[PDB]
């Protein structure tokens, strides 16, 4: 029985904009070489969506969700398929209505929120694994309702702040709203109005469904999550934190969390549990003076499973 190893790698540098980053595309290229060499992924099973000027497939909100939709077509029940999604780029938090929702910011600002990723993992059968590494600001909780295994509620002298030159991978809500206002030509405080007007069908699930219809849909996910739990989120920081973009525009920049993952893998060649990988990545960032706290969200069984099912 053949098992599939599918990957979607997304990197947003936002070049030549007001929200430029420099290490996100390098994070994607480094993670691609890692899964090709160490984890047995094949070139034809990997989709790369980066926003360099000459890119032919930009990481728009529709292209990202469609690529994640194509891995959703191939995961089968009883096959134990391995799905991987890396995101390096800007993140943001939007008001849930008293509460905030976490989201990633595609290059066209068609936000993908935590309910979109919760809907995605609820389309996967039991035994499948969806490992998501989101090196972005406010990345903690991006898979809504996924149990926190490592984070502020699951873990118990300060280190001097890093001397590296860093830039935040988080955009304020107003910066995201103003960006969408420059495209719609209208002014409203409801970000969903801009997103529905700009993207319509391709807008996030939170913005297309009425709140009560979303409540009915989330009730079906709550029932299914009691028996199937296939989502594994490794966030670069907590829900209330940002993630650091390290370096300048010299072609050598990188994400602090993505680099910490590469360091742990370089120093540990054997198979590593998902919980240990996040813990050792936290140790790297803590020692290096970074104040973001990577978090892990998955089931108890997947917390003890090896990263990307390495034997």
Swiss-Prot record:
GO terms for molecular function: cysteine-type endopeptidase activity; cysteine-type peptidase activity. Belongs to the peptidase C14B family. Its EC number is 3.4.22.-. It comes from the Eukaryota. Its main location: secreted. It comes from Arabidopsis thaliana (Mouse-ear cress). InterPro entries: Caspase-like_dom_sf, Metacaspase, Pept_C14_caspase. GO terms for biological process: proteolysis. The record marks 24 as: S-nitrosylation-insensitive cysteine. Keywords: Apoplast, Autocatalytic cleavage, Glycoprotein, Hydrolase, Protease, S-nitrosylation, Secreted, Thiol protease. The lineage of its organism: Eukaryota, Viridiplantae, Streptophyta, Embryophyta, Tracheophyta. This is Metacaspase-9.
């Amino acid at each position: 029985m053949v098992k599939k190893r599918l990957a979607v790698l997304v990197g947003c540098n936002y070049p030549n904009t007001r929200n430029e980053l420099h290490g996100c595309i390098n994070d994607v290229l480094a993670m691609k070489e890692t899964i090709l060499s160490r984890f047995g992924f094949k070139q034809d099973d990997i989709e790369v969506l980066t926003d360099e000027p000459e890119s032919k497939v930009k990481p728009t909100g529709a292209n990202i969700k469609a690529a994640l939709r194509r891995m959703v077509d191939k995961a089968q029940a009883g096959s134990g398929d391995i799905l991987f999604f890396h995101y390096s780029g800007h993140g943001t938090r939007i008001p849930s209505v008293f509460k905030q929702d976490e989201a990633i910011v595609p290059c066209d600002f068609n936000l993908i929120t935590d309910v979109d990723f919760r809907e995605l993992v609820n389309q996967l059968p039991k035994g499948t694994s969806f490992t998501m590494i989101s090196d972005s600001g406010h990345s903690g909780g991006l898979i809504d309702k996924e149990k926190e295994q490592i984070g502020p509620s699951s873990v118990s002298p300060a280190i001097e702040t890093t001397n590296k030159t860093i830039t935040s991978r988080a955009l304020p809500f107003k910066a995201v709203l103003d960006h969408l206002s420059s495209l719609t030509g209208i002014t409203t405080s409801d970000i969903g109005t801009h997103l529905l007007e700009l993207f319509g069908r391709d807008a996030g699930l939170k913005f297309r469904l009425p709140a009560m219809d979303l409540m009915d849909l989330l009730e079906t996910m709550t029932a299914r999550e009691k028996h199937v739990d296939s989502g594994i989120l490794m966030s670069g920081c907590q829900a209330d934190e940002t993630s650091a973009d390290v370096g300048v525009g010299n072609g050598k920049a990188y994400g602090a969390f993505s680099n910490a993952i590469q360091r742990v893998l370089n120093e540990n060649e054997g198979a590593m549990k998902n919980k240990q990988l996040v813990m050792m990545a936290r140790d790297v960032l803590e020692r290096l003076g970074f104040h973001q706290h990577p978090c892990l969200y998955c089931s108890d069984q997947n917390a003890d499973a090896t990263f990307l099912s390495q034997p």
